[PDB]
């Protein structure tokens, strides 16, 4: 079945630069959205979703789900996960997560 590839375990970024967070899926099946989160708890923060939501700091770089986050500050430090969902009803359901990429900030 599908695997989620986050080739970087960590990215060091100087404050004020952009951060590139890389992700690929190995398959298009099951159909469902790919999202980026900061954190892996229930309280994780949605960082990017393609079809819905407003994410002004995020640009996408199909099996490539890599993103760029503009103007990084120390507050952006954390671990970022690229997560595949399967379509569900009423809600989509998490199918697989990438390993996470830690964003560290050089102040
Ligand atoms: Cl499917």
For residues 77 and 105, what is the distance between their CA atoms, to the nearest angstrom?
Answer: 6
Please check whether residue 77 is in contact with residue 104, taking contact to mean a CB–CB distance below 8 angstroms. yes
Bridge partners of 30, per DSSP, are: none
DSSP string, 57-92: TEEE---B--EEE-S--GGG-EEEEEEEEE--SSS-
- For the record, the structure tokens of 20 come out as 């590139």
Torsion angle defined by CA atoms of residues 30, 85, 8 and 70, in that order, rounded to the nearest 10 degrees: 130
* Closest CA relative to residue 68, chosen from 22, 105, 99: 22
1 CA to centre of ligand 1 in angstroms:
11
The CA 4 to ligand 1 mean position distance, Å, reads 16
CATH class of 3-107: mainly beta
Resolution of the determined structure in angstroms stands at 1.2
* Ligand 1 centroid from CA 33, angstroms: 11
First to last CA, the chain: 41
Burial 26-40 (b: 16+ CB within 10 A, else e): eeeeeebebbbbbee
CB neighbour class for 43 (10 Å; exposed up to 12, middle 13-18, buried from 19): exposed
């Amino acid at each position: 079945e599908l695997q989620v590839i986050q080739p970087e375990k960590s990215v060091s970024v100087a404050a004020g630069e952009s951060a590139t967070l890389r992700c690929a899926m190995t398959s298009l099946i099951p159909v469902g959205p790919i999202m980026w989160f900061r954190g892996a708890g229930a309280g994780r923060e949605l960082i990017y979703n393609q079809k819905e939501g407003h994410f002004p700091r995020v640009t996408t770089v199909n099996l490539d789900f890599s993103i760029s986050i503009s103007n990084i500050t120390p507050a952006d430090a954390g671990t970022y996960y690229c997560v595949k969902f399967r379509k569900g009803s009423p809600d989509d359901v998490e199918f697989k997560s990438g390993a996470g990429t830690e964003l560290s900030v050089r102040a």
